Design an enzyme around this catalytic site. Sequence first.
Site, PDB file in Angstrom:
ATOM      1  N   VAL A 165       1.071  -0.747   0.279  1.00 16.25           N
ATOM      2  CA  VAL A 165       0.168  -0.009  -0.006  1.00 16.25           C
ATOM      3  C   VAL A 165       0.783   0.619   0.158  1.00 16.25           C
ATOM      4  O   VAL A 165       1.853   1.617   0.382  1.00 16.25           O
ATOM      5  CB  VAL A 165      -0.810   0.132   0.809  1.00 16.25           C
ATOM      6  N   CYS A 166       0.453   2.401  -0.512  1.00 14.83           N
ATOM      7  CA  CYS A 166       1.767   3.466  -0.506  1.00 14.83           C
ATOM      8  C   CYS A 166       0.735   4.607   1.252  1.00 14.83           C
ATOM      9  O   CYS A 166      -0.410   4.310   1.492  1.00 14.83           O
ATOM     10  CB  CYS A 166       0.891   5.004  -1.537  1.00 14.83           C
ATOM     11  N   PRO A 167       1.754   4.714   1.198  1.00  8.38           N
ATOM     12  CA  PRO A 167       1.666   5.865   3.282  1.00  8.38           C
ATOM     13  C   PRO A 167       0.946   6.464   2.733  1.00  8.38           C
ATOM     14  O   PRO A 167      -0.172   6.570   4.027  1.00  8.38           O
ATOM     15  CB  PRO A 167       2.947   5.389   3.711  1.00  8.38           C
TER      16      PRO A 167
END
EC number: 1.11.1.24
Lengths: 176, 179
Positions: free
Chosen positions: A48-50
């Site tokens: 996931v992208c933070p």
Amino acid sequence: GNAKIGHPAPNFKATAVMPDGQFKDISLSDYKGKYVVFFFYPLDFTFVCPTEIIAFSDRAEEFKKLNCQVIGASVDSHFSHLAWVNTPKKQGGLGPMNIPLVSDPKRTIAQDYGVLKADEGISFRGLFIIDDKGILRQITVNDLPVGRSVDETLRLVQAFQFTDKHGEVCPAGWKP
Amino acid sequence: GSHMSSGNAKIGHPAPNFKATAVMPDGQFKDISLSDYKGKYVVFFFYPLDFTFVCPTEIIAFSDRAEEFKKLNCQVIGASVDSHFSHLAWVNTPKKQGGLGPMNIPLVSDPKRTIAQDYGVLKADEGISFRGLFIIDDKGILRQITVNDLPVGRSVDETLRLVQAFQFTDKHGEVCPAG
Ligand SMILES: C[C@H](CCC(=O)NCCC[N+](C)(C)CCCS(=O)(=O)[O-])[C@H]1CC[C@H]2[C@@H]3[C@H](O)C[C@@H]4C[C@H](O)CC[C@]4(C)[C@H]3C[C@H](O)[C@]12C
């Protein structure tokens, strides 16, 4: 899955990491009387992208103004959620959070929400909109590896609440 | 089956194929299959109730801008539980009289509700507005399911950006500048 539009959101009791940094067992029903944005993302740190969690944390007050609680979720344990929270965001970590993060290491919440890849044991990206009565109003599931738009999500919650109050904005075809 | 609470449509898998009679933009009937659009993105709207229950302006707005999806190598298709003659009647009724008028996109009929079943969108308890959007990529793979009962017309602009996000990410991978 059991999640279905027009039925109560499947209720879970799960360990979450709360904004204050602590573990608490929570339930979706805790938030009855408020709209809920419940989103599933695949995996802390690696899938996931933070920023798709950070952008919701940062703007959580725009949601509380709409009487709406935002909750994130993944199949990660609460230990792994807390680790990512305690990783600084200039280190691509989450940093401190204004929203709770539900843990689903047994994969039964993801299964129930109909977002589990059973073989891989990770969820797809899922967005659930649940109304103040606990009833599921939208499901979006996809495998699109970009961040959800906070602005769009606010607008959606607004559209649901507006039409809750006023009825159809785009009238059915039979109507005069 | 699916990870979905009903249907056989599964993200990351081939979209369930269907062969069904369509009313094509000029008003001829043609029996078509979703596989006929392999090589192109597809934006598939499914209306689990007949068009009397649907907001015609939603479908109209997509038909009106279909050229913009065509530029993205994307076919828009609309479908409902209407019979094929019902659809013909709707397109042959001018907008001004409350019909659809001519469409720039095919309309697929599912009077037996077999497409609905397959796509997990048989009408049940929900608000009357319950309907679905499905994004299928050029390899025939299901990439998104969205379902809701929001009685607001879906945004063409958002949908275009969505398709472009899928296409961007298909060729350049994940997006995460700050990752
Ligand atoms: C009852 C409604 C009309 C309701 C209405 O009054 N709708 C408001 C629109 C008014 N507006 C001013 C907003 C239009 C916008 C102007 S604009 O030109 O800019 O779009 C009309 C609109 C089109 C109609 C069907 C179609 O014929 C196809 C078919 C023909 C069959 O034989 C009989 C069955 C069927 C299903 C018809 C039944 C019914 O009869 C419908 C739903």
